[PDB]
Design a protein around this ligand. Structure first.
Ligand SMILES: *Cc1ccc(S(=O)(=O)N2CCC(N(C)C)CC2)cc1
Ligand SMILES: *Cc1ccc(S(=O)(=O)N2CCC(N(C)C)CC2)cc1
Ligand SMILES: [Ca+2]
Ligand SMILES: [Ca+2]
Lengths: 9, 227, 227, 9
């Protein structure tokens, strides 16, 4: 299950 | 970072991202928050990206060590898992502290307030991932409360295709599935979010359509795994 | 790490590698070296892997920032490049300090002594990558001197297929090409090393053959780029 | 030009 990656602007 | 200009901290956070120096990036953005001014949309994203990378590395390490520890059951694996866990909790507490002093209370527009409340839910969720027992219960309720307030605002104030609204619903659905032991609530939220976004796509430009459909595919990816 | 047992530091270094926590891994291995006992083959490799990962991330970041700085020519890019550069130099100085106090002087077997002298050449080479001017000259000579002593021992004491001998020759050839402005010396060393290893492969077991040919392919990869 | 990767035990 994946949350928002959120690791690149 | 008290002696560095706000604008220089922001510029260095962008350089740190390019250099894949995420601990530096987070320290620069913490310094920028502590200048006391509200953050722009771009600055909020830099803050979030920095800490998501830092805590993401810690979570990955904690999961590796926790798996080794579980298979083992000397003190070294537990001790080192505890060290990583304490570091992870410290980063989560730092982010939560920035949100509480004073990002959330000064956030009056729906876009900023939902963004910060989603962060608050996420970092309580990361605390919940490593918590054990009754402390876990209150941490779980803190995550749920933050996500729920963000959801309530987002449904009143943002269109169903708004990427922050979509990402909030995605992460709250993961909370339901992975943390709260509520897979049916997770599935229902993901399905309803996806369907309401689909019905609103016709209102969007080509660029906004791309932004929204990318997150919709993440909702569908979870639904595929969960059903 | 003075209060932690040597064996616990080694065990935690292995866990840190699995968790991709290379700064921790390097700190554990520094603590193990500072116990004052010589290192086994496996322990030397843990020390080298830890610091190569730490300095490798710093070098990659320094190159990103140096490229941005060169394209730009406020003070922020230079200041941040300098910060990363100083951190990188500090890690190199730490490794060189461990080698000088007292890993090299206690290393009497060819395998350990060549290993440590190759490290010494590598970390002076990383210092040379960021050095400017006449300081660069003495740093370059320090790298060359360490590699040359390692080469002299390796040619007297190890077969031409030994993986440490091969990796030393590979890295010294890179030094010649990239640092010393001696591409012809780099090519000659890589070619001679490859050819002498090829002629010795018949003596090896299946597993040793795999070890040696993997590094030989790296020599060939460089020769392909250089010719 | 590549040196020994050297980043995995
Ligand atoms: C939880 C969250 C954070 C940020 C967004 S975003 O700003 O719309 N956006 C999502 C995709 C990312 N890639 C394009 C890099 C960038 C940030 C949405 C939800
Ligand atoms: C410079 C150097 C260091 C180490 C070696 S090694 O021990 O023979 N070996 C090379 C390949 C690596 N992969 C198999 C992971 C492991 C270490 C050789 C040269
Ligand atoms: Ca100012
Ligand atoms: Ca002891």
């Amino acid at each position: 299950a994946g949350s928002i990656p959120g690791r690149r602007s | 970072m008290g002696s560095m200009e706000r604008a220089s901290l922001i510029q260095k956070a962008k350089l740190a991202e390019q250099a894949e120096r995420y601990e530096d990036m987070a320290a620069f953005m913490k310094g920028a928050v502590e200048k006391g001014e509200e953050l722009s949309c771009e600055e909020r994203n830099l803050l979030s990206v920095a800490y998501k990378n830092v805590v993401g590395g810690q979570r990955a390490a904690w999961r590796v060590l926790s798996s080794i520890e579980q298979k083992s059951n000397g003190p070294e694996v537990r001790e080192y898992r505890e060290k990583v866990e304490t570091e992870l909790q410290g980063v989560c507490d730092t982010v939560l502290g920035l949100l509480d002093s004073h990002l959330i209370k000064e956030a009056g527009d729906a876009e900023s307030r939902v963004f910060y409340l989603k962060m608050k839910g996420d970092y309580y969720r990361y605390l919940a991932e490593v918590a054990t027992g009754d402390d876990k219960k209150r941490i779980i309720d803190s995550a749920r409360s933050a996500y729920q307030e963000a959801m309530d605002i987002s449904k009143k104030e943002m269109p169903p295709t708004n990427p922050i609204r979509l990402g909030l619903a995605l992460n709250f659905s993961v909370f339901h599935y992975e943390i709260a032991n509520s897979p049916e609530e997770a599935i229902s939220l993901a399905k309803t979010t996806f369907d309401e976004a689909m019905a609103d796509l016709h209102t969007l430009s080509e660029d906004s359509y791309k932004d929204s459909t990318l997150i919709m595919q993440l909702l569908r990816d979870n639904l595929t795994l969960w059903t």
